[PDB]
Each structure stands twice: as C-alpha cells, then as structure tokens.
C-alpha cells in the first residue's frame, strides 16, 4: 500500500504475460480486446502460462450481459460473461473475424476461468499502480481525438477529453528521461502499425481522472 513498496517500474510485456498486439479492424470490438488482454495477463501472472484468448467468443456470446459485438460493449459485462459461462476459449479455438455472427461457444474448450472481477478504486494513481503490480488492467478512455488517431511514439500528454469511448489495457508504468515525464504503458488493439508497435506511453500525472479518463472506469479479473 505504501508507494515505496510499489516497484519503480512495471512492464508485464518483459515478464512474458502479454500476447502480441492484435487488430480489431473495422469493428467496435475494443471492449473484447481489453478483456482478453486482462485475462491473458492475469492468468499468466498466476500460472506463468500465456494463452491468447478469444475476442470473437465475447462478441458472439455475451449479448445477455449487455454487449453488442461490433456495435460496442464494456469490459465488466464481458468479465461477467466469462464468470457466467464458466470461462473463455482460446484465440486459436475461436478466432477473430471482426464481424457479427451467432455464438458457437459450444464449439471449444474453456481454457481460462475467473473467480470474479474488481474495479480499481477511482481517481487514484497510487491505486492504479498497486493494481498494475498484480496484473494488467482494463481501462476506458476517450480515444477519438486526432492526436490519438495518429499517435506514433513519445509520452502522450495531449489535452485529452473524458468522453469514454474506447477500451484498452495498461500493462505497466515507468518514467521517460527524454521528456522527463512519468507514464503508463498502454496496449491498444489497432495493430502494430499504430503507435509504438501498437502501444502508447500515456502521461501519468494528468489529474484525478487520468489521461483521457483512464482512472474513471478501470477494472481487472480475479483468478
């Protein structure tokens, strides 16, 4: 709980708990990618095994919990589905098509399961660091502004709105000597041609809402 007790940096990528960057393409499925990334990271944090999981299953099968496939959804409704249904299938078993279709989750083995899911206490950088010490964290942000659309690299400290419209994953934090700014390490789902091989280094100290609202609606799976 004391900040000294938290590590100076965290990067789940170099611990081996992050799958390669994925690409949602022209489908409003970000919520599913944020969810699978959190589940991939939490399962690996616990077992040491990294298994890439199915976004398509979430899209096709979680409408009862409130999600609407390519028309949008949210991470907690997705975690609820995983809890409800007894887990989630692998990416290989149930691959990503970026299109709406009927559920086939009878077609594959549930390989990762959860006990539940928790929200990160709101408006606290310390709380986010503490959560990230344990595993990657699902966050919601406003991600529609032009600087965001064309982000390449560097610490993203742009003046950002808080109309939450995109779901992504934080995989750690650290500090940049180039800009002299602390950051969160964010994993996006727009492929490796966006940002820093698919990642964004987001400014850490942008007030109680987080950069682009990232402290407003953050959560993670419990295993």
């Amino acid at each position: 709980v004391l900040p000294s007790e938290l590590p100076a940096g965290v990067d789940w990528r170099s611990r081996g708990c992050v799958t390669p960057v994925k690409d949602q393409r022209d489908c409003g499925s970000c919520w599913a990618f944020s969810t699978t990334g959190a589940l991939e990271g939490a399962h690996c944090a616990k077992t040491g095994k990294l298994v890439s999981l199915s976004e398509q299953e979430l899209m096709d099968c979680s409408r009862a919990e409130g999600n609407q496939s390519c028309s949008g959804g949210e991470m907690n409704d997705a975690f609820q589905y995983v809890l409800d249904s007894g887990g989630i299938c692998s990416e290989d078993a149930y691959p990503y098509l970026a299109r709406d279709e009927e559920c086939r989750a009878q077609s594959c083995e549930k390989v990762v399961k959860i006990l539940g899911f928790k929200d990160v206490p709101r408006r606290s950088e310390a709380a986010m660091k503490a959560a990230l010490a344990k595993s990657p964290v699902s966050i919601a942000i406003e991600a529609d502004q032009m600087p965001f659309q064309f982000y390449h690299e560097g610490v993203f400290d742009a003046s950002c709105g808080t109309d939450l419209d995109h779901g992504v994953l934080l995989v750690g934090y650290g500090t940049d000597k180039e800009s002299k700014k602390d950051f969160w390490i964010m994993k996006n789902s727009w492929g490796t041609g966006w940002g820093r091989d698919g990642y964004m280094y987001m400014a850490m100290h942008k007030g109680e809402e987080g950069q682009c609202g990232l402290l407003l609606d953050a959560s993670f799976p419990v295993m």
């Binding site: 949602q24 022209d26 489908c27 409003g28 499925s29 970000c30 919520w31 944020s34 609407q68 390519c70 028309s71 949008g72 959804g73 949210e74 991470m75 919601a140 991600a143 529609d144 502004q145 032009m146 600087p147 659309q149 064309f150 982000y151 390449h152 690299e153 560097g154 610490v155 993203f156 400290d157 742009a158 939450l164 419209d165 995109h166 779901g167 800009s179 700014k181 727009w190 492929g191 041609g193 966006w194 280094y201 400014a203 609606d217």
Partner: protein, 75 residues
Amino acid sequence: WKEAHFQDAFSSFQAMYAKSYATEEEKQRRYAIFKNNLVYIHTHNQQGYSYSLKMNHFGDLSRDEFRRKYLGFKK
C-alpha cells in the same frame, strides 16, 4: 506542398494499405480527408510536442468515422 506531392502521397498510401474505392465520389472524399490528415500530422510534428504523429491505416478517416466504427466502448 503542391497538389502533385499530395497526389503521390495518396497513391503510396493506397498501395501501402491496399486501399481501393468503389466510386470516384468516395475516392475524392477519401483523398480530401487524407490530405487534411497529412497536413495535420506534418504541422503537428513541427510544433515540438512530447510525442509524434505518423500516418497509418486510419489515414483516410475523419474523426467522426474513426469514432463511430473503430473504437467500441459503450457504458
């Protein structure tokens, strides 16, 4: 830049991302959006920010189109 620079840049964009257009009306719209984004990126990168921008596969989309279809978080 002259128009020919923008024209060359758009052809390279089309080749690099395999972007094609079903009507001449769509292509002219997408060219205009592309040019606007290209100018934005170039101008931004002259301004000395902590981060840079780069053209990418969203290059021919406006903010509204980008938001409506390429994001997806709905609370």
